[PDB]
Structures are given as structure tokens and as C-alpha cells.
Amino acid sequence: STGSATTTPIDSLDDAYITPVQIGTPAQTLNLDFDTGSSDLWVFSSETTASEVDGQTIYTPSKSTTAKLLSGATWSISYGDGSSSSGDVYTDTVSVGGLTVTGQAVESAKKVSSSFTEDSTIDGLLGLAFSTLNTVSPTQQKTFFDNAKASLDSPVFTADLGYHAPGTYNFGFIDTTAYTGSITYTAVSTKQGFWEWTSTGYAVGSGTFKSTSIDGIADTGTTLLYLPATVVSAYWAQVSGAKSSSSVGGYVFPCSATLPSFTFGVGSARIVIPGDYIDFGPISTGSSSCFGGIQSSAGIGINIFGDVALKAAFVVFNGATTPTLGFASK
């Protein structure tokens, strides 16, 4: 089997991407944030505290003939930005882009934090990291990808995120028309449950490439590119007037600037992030200070190749027995 679904930015900044997902019978379509940095499929639901729902589409298990309570199971998750959600669990039929999994754990939110409530465009998350990170207790559950794997033509999914435009998540096949050149594969460590890999270095603009190992995660659920302070300082030093603002919470730059590109290494290959991808616009409406798309990972504890980096590439998440990650230019 295979699946193919379009993923669409939620706003003009590509703050996140939403992908329609069919849950239950008859289908209930919810727009989920596909997140390679976590491993829970959770949704706003008929059980979500009413004051915490503001415009989201909800899953109602009582209206699905294939829903079954996963008796006694609960879940609770906290993300890197401090947001969180929790609730109970149903199994149901879940389809993405024509690919169907029966008996998928669908985690129904009873509570969500304010950041989720305030974002009316995201109806939940679909985790695509390793199932060892799944938070369901007392019986840990598998991700949609892990459940789908055995039916897939090939044990892979691909992320092809657009810049200010829709893109595609494919399951079970590599679309050789979706990228240019060849795919460079690199080793993955699953020790922390993430798609964790080591970049071979970086360049700023037209500058020389610095060969240096940068361990980080490929995370479609994180908006920005978070790298060591040394790297990030070297980037912003090339932008007149750029500075790190403790009041704003990161690097800002004059909205009049032209940003340099940023290159990262994948083995001997190179992925170039155009400067425009690094512009996240005014810090507040009408401001002449703009928020940077490359930020320091100091204090996070891990480097994160989020959407800013991933959208510059066609990315293969190879879930074979020995997992790997592939990157191609596009």
C-alpha cells in the first residue's frame, strides 16, 4: 500500500503545516500537524474541556461505528515549547492520503494548553517519531507509521514541505519526480526516540564551508532551525543590525535586511536554505524588527532541524530495520 497527502501552511509564515486525516466510520476529517518530533496521535474531541476549544474540528468517538475505548489507557504529553495536552484513548480506523490503518490509537484530549486552544487551525498532532516516545500508559501505543509499515510497499515516509506553499507527505514510496539530483542518506540514532542524525557542517551565505559535526533531530513539528550558539552567531553576524533580544526571545534583525542563505551538510552533500526562508516577519504587527528563522539551541539540550531546514529539501524518513534519513535538493 501507499498514501499521499497534501500538507498546507497554517498561515503566511509557515508557522506549521496541517494535513487532513480521516478518523472513524463514517470518516471524520481533522487537520493534524504531522510531527516527526513526537509519537502521539492526539485530537481535539467531544471530551475536550469546552472552554479549551475555540474553532477546532473535534473527533466524536460516539459517532464512529469503529471506535472502541482502549480501556484504562491515558496519555499526557509536554512539548519543547511548554505546550501540553492529555486525555484518554480510543482505537479507530485512521486514513492518510488513501492509506488506512485499522486499530490505530487515537488519543482523545480532555485538556489542552492555551497555545493549542488559541490555534484554531490545528485539530491535533500525528506523531511520526519512534514509538518508544509514545506517552500512552500503561500500554504504550504505536505510531500511525509503525502500524502502517508492514502493509507499505516500502517502510518509508517522505516530507516535502513547501515555502509559503503546500507540500506533500508520502507513505510507502519515494516520488523520484519530487526532487533534483540524488538522495544522500545518513545514519540515524534512535537512542532518544527521535530521527537523530549528524550534519557534517555549515556555511553562511557565500562563505566557506565549516566542517563540524552537528548532532540534531529532523523535526517537522518545530518551525525554526535551532543550532549551537557558535553557528547561530556566525550567521547573524552577517546581517547588519541583527542581535539577540532577551525581551523578544531570540535573534531579531532589521526588516530592511536582505538575509544570506544558510547551507548545512549531509555527508558530502549540501542543502541550501535561501535567505528568504529565514525571515519570520515583524515581531509584532507593524514592527520594523523581524524575527529570525535560525535560533540558538542553547538551553534546549538538542539541535533541531525544524521546518526552516526541512522545507529546503526532499526528506526521506527510512524506517527499515536500520533507520536512516535521506536529503535531496528540490
Ligand SMILES: COC(=O)[C@@H](N)Cc1ccccc1
Ligand atoms: C517545539 O515543537 C515541538 O516540540 C514539536 N516536535 C511538537 C509541537 C508541534 C506543535 C505545537 C507544539 C509542539
